[PDB]
């Protein structure tokens, strides 16, 4: 696995960001994590939706450098979204949300599961500290 450069276009919510990637706008969905939703059809904003969403927004807007890392499987979902690990200044945003109690570790699909052990461990820690989602 390799980090590639990307540029911010716009943060969409806690787990979706639009990035310019090899000169193309593309929407990216964060591998293995589920944030509460702000745009979700039923139920309007979920609890911690606005906070997961502000966390992602601040992280990417204040970054010097944004990089995307694809896993070993398919690289786009059915909706056309890139599926990646996102790094803002070397910190992986997917782990950072999970660590802060602002995302759950998703239902994982081999082969896109390289960093799954590392995220279940941050989630264990967030639960143990009872953060946000877990209070």
PDB file of C-alpha atoms in Angstrom:
ATOM      1  CA  UNK A   1       0.000   0.000   0.000  1.00  0.00           C
ATOM      2  CA  UNK A   2       1.080   3.547  -0.963  1.00  0.00           C
ATOM      3  CA  UNK A   3      -0.006   7.110  -0.086  1.00  0.00           C
ATOM      4  CA  UNK A   4      -0.915   9.360  -2.996  1.00  0.00           C
ATOM      5  CA  UNK A   5      -1.439  13.125  -2.946  1.00  0.00           C
ATOM      6  CA  UNK A   6      -4.904  14.639  -3.089  1.00  0.00           C
ATOM      7  CA  UNK A   7      -6.318  18.129  -2.724  1.00  0.00           C
ATOM      8  CA  UNK A   8      -9.374  19.179  -0.709  1.00  0.00           C
ATOM      9  CA  UNK A   9     -12.444  20.297  -2.573  1.00  0.00           C
ATOM     10  CA  UNK A  10     -15.005  20.017   0.267  1.00  0.00           C
ATOM     11  CA  UNK A  11     -15.787  17.960   3.385  1.00  0.00           C
ATOM     12  CA  UNK A  12     -19.251  16.468   3.009  1.00  0.00           C
ATOM     13  CA  UNK A  13     -19.909  14.901   6.440  1.00  0.00           C
ATOM     14  CA  UNK A  14     -18.002  12.817   9.002  1.00  0.00           C
ATOM     15  CA  UNK A  15     -17.047  10.052   6.566  1.00  0.00           C
ATOM     16  CA  UNK A  16     -17.320  11.515   3.056  1.00  0.00           C
ATOM     17  CA  UNK A  17     -14.934  14.058   1.573  1.00  0.00           C
ATOM     18  CA  UNK A  18     -14.617  15.390  -1.928  1.00  0.00           C
ATOM     19  CA  UNK A  19     -11.024  15.549  -3.130  1.00  0.00           C
ATOM     20  CA  UNK A  20      -9.220  16.291  -6.357  1.00  0.00           C
ATOM     21  CA  UNK A  21      -7.343  13.124  -7.231  1.00  0.00           C
ATOM     22  CA  UNK A  22      -5.089  12.929 -10.370  1.00  0.00           C
ATOM     23  CA  UNK A  23      -6.731  16.124 -11.525  1.00  0.00           C
ATOM     24  CA  UNK A  24     -10.305  14.751 -11.084  1.00  0.00           C
ATOM     25  CA  UNK A  25     -12.997  15.653  -8.447  1.00  0.00           C
ATOM     26  CA  UNK A  26     -14.018  12.535  -6.812  1.00  0.00           C
ATOM     27  CA  UNK A  27     -16.006  11.838  -3.695  1.00  0.00           C
ATOM     28  CA  UNK A  28     -14.200   9.572  -1.173  1.00  0.00           C
ATOM     29  CA  UNK A  29     -15.841   7.357   1.443  1.00  0.00           C
ATOM     30  CA  UNK A  30     -13.608   6.490   4.457  1.00  0.00           C
ATOM     31  CA  UNK A  31     -12.880   2.761   4.626  1.00  0.00           C
ATOM     32  CA  UNK A  32     -14.081   0.786   7.578  1.00  0.00           C
ATOM     33  CA  UNK A  33     -15.781   3.415   9.641  1.00  0.00           C
ATOM     34  CA  UNK A  34     -19.283   4.552  10.155  1.00  0.00           C
ATOM     35  CA  UNK A  35     -19.944   8.167  11.435  1.00  0.00           C
ATOM     36  CA  UNK A  36     -23.372   9.257  12.554  1.00  0.00           C
ATOM     37  CA  UNK A  37     -25.175  10.985   9.752  1.00  0.00           C
ATOM     38  CA  UNK A  38     -26.210  14.560   9.128  1.00  0.00           C
ATOM     39  CA  UNK A  39     -27.752  13.998   5.660  1.00  0.00           C
ATOM     40  CA  UNK A  40     -29.363  10.522   6.288  1.00  0.00           C
ATOM     41  CA  UNK A  41     -32.895  10.278   4.628  1.00  0.00           C
ATOM     42  CA  UNK A  42     -34.785   9.056   7.688  1.00  0.00           C
ATOM     43  CA  UNK A  43     -34.101  10.710  11.080  1.00  0.00           C
ATOM     44  CA  UNK A  44     -32.344  14.073   9.968  1.00  0.00           C
ATOM     45  CA  UNK A  45     -29.174  14.492  12.050  1.00  0.00           C
ATOM     46  CA  UNK A  46     -28.220  11.592  14.234  1.00  0.00           C
ATOM     47  CA  UNK A  47     -26.592  12.263  17.563  1.00  0.00           C
ATOM     48  CA  UNK A  48     -22.850  13.132  17.118  1.00  0.00           C
ATOM     49  CA  UNK A  49     -23.473  13.619  13.353  1.00  0.00           C
ATOM     50  CA  UNK A  50     -22.687  17.347  13.590  1.00  0.00           C
ATOM     51  CA  UNK A  51     -19.637  16.754  15.786  1.00  0.00           C
ATOM     52  CA  UNK A  52     -18.198  13.913  13.571  1.00  0.00           C
ATOM     53  CA  UNK A  53     -18.768  16.161  10.658  1.00  0.00           C
ATOM     54  CA  UNK A  54     -17.022  19.175  12.285  1.00  0.00           C
ATOM     55  CA  UNK A  55     -14.117  17.001  13.331  1.00  0.00           C
ATOM     56  CA  UNK A  56     -13.526  15.786   9.745  1.00  0.00           C
ATOM     57  CA  UNK A  57     -13.991  19.321   8.378  1.00  0.00           C
ATOM     58  CA  UNK A  58     -11.379  20.928  10.731  1.00  0.00           C
ATOM     59  CA  UNK A  59      -8.943  18.100  10.163  1.00  0.00           C
ATOM     60  CA  UNK A  60      -8.900  18.360   6.401  1.00  0.00           C
ATOM     61  CA  UNK A  61      -9.303  22.165   6.089  1.00  0.00           C
ATOM     62  CA  UNK A  62      -6.292  22.793   8.360  1.00  0.00           C
ATOM     63  CA  UNK A  63      -4.038  20.116   6.815  1.00  0.00           C
ATOM     64  CA  UNK A  64      -0.815  21.002   5.055  1.00  0.00           C
ATOM     65  CA  UNK A  65      -1.009  17.748   3.181  1.00  0.00           C
ATOM     66  CA  UNK A  66      -3.858  15.304   2.354  1.00  0.00           C
ATOM     67  CA  UNK A  67      -3.006  11.836   1.133  1.00  0.00           C
ATOM     68  CA  UNK A  68      -5.256   8.893   0.149  1.00  0.00           C
ATOM     69  CA  UNK A  69      -4.301   5.241   0.471  1.00  0.00           C
ATOM     70  CA  UNK A  70      -6.406   2.611  -1.370  1.00  0.00           C
ATOM     71  CA  UNK A  71      -6.612  -0.888   0.140  1.00  0.00           C
ATOM     72  CA  UNK A  72      -5.989  -4.170  -1.894  1.00  0.00           C
ATOM     73  CA  UNK A  73      -9.564  -4.657  -3.244  1.00  0.00           C
ATOM     74  CA  UNK A  74     -11.865  -2.663  -5.432  1.00  0.00           C
ATOM     75  CA  UNK A  75     -11.186   1.062  -5.234  1.00  0.00           C
ATOM     76  CA  UNK A  76     -14.650   2.548  -5.769  1.00  0.00           C
ATOM     77  CA  UNK A  77     -18.012   1.496  -4.296  1.00  0.00           C
ATOM     78  CA  UNK A  78     -21.328   1.047  -6.200  1.00  0.00           C
ATOM     79  CA  UNK A  79     -22.006   4.785  -5.859  1.00  0.00           C
ATOM     80  CA  UNK A  80     -18.805   5.782  -7.609  1.00  0.00           C
ATOM     81  CA  UNK A  81     -17.077   6.877  -4.381  1.00  0.00           C
ATOM     82  CA  UNK A  82     -13.276   6.190  -3.960  1.00  0.00           C
ATOM     83  CA  UNK A  83     -12.742   3.894  -1.000  1.00  0.00           C
ATOM     84  CA  UNK A  84      -9.621   4.944   0.927  1.00  0.00           C
ATOM     85  CA  UNK A  85      -7.747   5.622   4.069  1.00  0.00           C
ATOM     86  CA  UNK A  86      -7.362   9.403   4.326  1.00  0.00           C
ATOM     87  CA  UNK A  87      -4.306  11.046   5.984  1.00  0.00           C
ATOM     88  CA  UNK A  88      -4.253  14.739   7.026  1.00  0.00           C
ATOM     89  CA  UNK A  89      -0.551  15.635   7.787  1.00  0.00           C
ATOM     90  CA  UNK A  90       0.354  12.016   8.292  1.00  0.00           C
ATOM     91  CA  UNK A  91      -2.600  11.287  10.712  1.00  0.00           C
ATOM     92  CA  UNK A  92      -5.190   8.791   9.336  1.00  0.00           C
ATOM     93  CA  UNK A  93      -8.529  10.431   9.715  1.00  0.00           C
ATOM     94  CA  UNK A  94     -10.335   7.061   9.787  1.00  0.00           C
ATOM     95  CA  UNK A  95      -8.512   5.977  13.015  1.00  0.00           C
ATOM     96  CA  UNK A  96      -8.789   9.461  14.527  1.00  0.00           C
ATOM     97  CA  UNK A  97     -12.595   9.454  14.367  1.00  0.00           C
ATOM     98  CA  UNK A  98     -12.779   6.008  15.851  1.00  0.00           C
ATOM     99  CA  UNK A  99     -10.337   7.012  18.592  1.00  0.00           C
ATOM    100  CA  UNK A 100     -12.494  10.005  19.548  1.00  0.00           C
ATOM    101  CA  UNK A 101     -15.665   7.973  19.879  1.00  0.00           C
ATOM    102  CA  UNK A 102     -17.020   9.667  16.698  1.00  0.00           C
ATOM    103  CA  UNK A 103     -17.225   6.595  14.390  1.00  0.00           C
ATOM    104  CA  UNK A 104     -17.933   2.838  14.834  1.00  0.00           C
ATOM    105  CA  UNK A 105     -15.775   0.312  12.994  1.00  0.00           C
ATOM    106  CA  UNK A 106     -17.934  -0.755  10.001  1.00  0.00           C
ATOM    107  CA  UNK A 107     -18.858  -4.195   8.630  1.00  0.00           C
ATOM    108  CA  UNK A 108     -15.592  -5.144   6.923  1.00  0.00           C
ATOM    109  CA  UNK A 109     -15.242  -6.614   3.435  1.00  0.00           C
ATOM    110  CA  UNK A 110     -12.178  -8.616   2.455  1.00  0.00           C
ATOM    111  CA  UNK A 111      -9.960  -7.788   0.784  1.00  0.00           C
ATOM    112  CA  UNK A 112     -10.469  -4.108   1.877  1.00  0.00           C
ATOM    113  CA  UNK A 113      -9.481  -4.685   5.469  1.00  0.00           C
ATOM    114  CA  UNK A 114      -5.736  -4.005   5.923  1.00  0.00           C
ATOM    115  CA  UNK A 115      -6.087  -1.520   8.801  1.00  0.00           C
ATOM    116  CA  UNK A 116      -9.032  -3.312  10.543  1.00  0.00           C
ATOM    117  CA  UNK A 117      -7.141  -4.576  13.641  1.00  0.00           C
ATOM    118  CA  UNK A 118      -5.702  -1.107  14.297  1.00  0.00           C
ATOM    119  CA  UNK A 119      -9.221   0.473  14.217  1.00  0.00           C
ATOM    120  CA  UNK A 120     -10.898  -2.138  16.457  1.00  0.00           C
ATOM    121  CA  UNK A 121      -8.174  -1.373  18.985  1.00  0.00           C
ATOM    122  CA  UNK A 122      -8.850   2.447  18.919  1.00  0.00           C
ATOM    123  CA  UNK A 123     -12.551   1.709  19.227  1.00  0.00           C
ATOM    124  CA  UNK A 124     -11.938  -0.579  22.237  1.00  0.00           C
ATOM    125  CA  UNK A 125     -10.015   2.404  23.778  1.00  0.00           C
ATOM    126  CA  UNK A 126     -12.812   4.905  22.948  1.00  0.00           C
ATOM    127  CA  UNK A 127     -15.428   2.584  24.515  1.00  0.00           C
ATOM    128  CA  UNK A 128     -13.271   1.976  27.590  1.00  0.00           C
ATOM    129  CA  UNK A 129     -12.916   5.823  27.940  1.00  0.00           C
ATOM    130  CA  UNK A 130     -16.664   6.116  27.237  1.00  0.00           C
ATOM    131  CA  UNK A 131     -16.228   8.839  24.570  1.00  0.00           C
ATOM    132  CA  UNK A 132     -19.031  10.592  22.639  1.00  0.00           C
ATOM    133  CA  UNK A 133     -20.835   7.715  20.846  1.00  0.00           C
ATOM    134  CA  UNK A 134     -19.986   5.491  23.830  1.00  0.00           C
ATOM    135  CA  UNK A 135     -21.128   7.592  26.823  1.00  0.00           C
TER     136      UNK A 135
END
